């Protein structure tokens with residue numbers, strides 16, 4: 743056996759962003775940034791050909807909803823790309839299509855920022871302001887809709903993934 747090491751910390755809290763125009767000072771309430779570096783996940787209907795080329799881009803870094811509580815409660819275009827600590831959250835998204843695997847620094851830990859008592863706390867969300875560059879997307883597994891399971895012989899690694907710890 744061996745015990746795991748601690749995580750590298752980038753000076754820039756949105757180092758991972760695919761759209762660097764995001765304005766960290768407009769995030770409300772004051773963000774509590776994730777400091778761990780385990781695999782995160784994102785259920786998305788968008789296909790890997792697109793995600794591996796572009797990364798995850800947010801809907802609207804300019805005029806989107808920068809208030810995290812508002813974004814979480816009432817889905818609206820925002821500067822954030824949502825991910826989760828929970829490998830299995832894809833089972834709750836119908837027509838999910840894909841479970842993406844993400845190894846990215848930072849992100850806003852939603853429950854540490856707005857509390858763990860709101861309606862969607864069990865999503866254990868990490869919100870990435872400005873999204874996530876493709877170099878931080880490990881890969882993807884397609885999801886079988888009828889059983890809500892991963893088609894594990896059809897997982898694909900992202901050729902652009904760059905390990906960093």
Ligand SMILES: CN(C)CC(=O)Nc1ccc2[nH]c(=O)c3ccccc3c2c1
Pocket residue numbers: 783784785786799800801817818822823824825826831865866867868
């Ligand atoms: C960037 N938009 C396409 C995303 C959207 O409007 N909703 C959305 C779309 C996909 C999402 N996927 C997730 O894995 C997730 C995990 C924790 C919390 C939220 C999500 C999530 C939310």
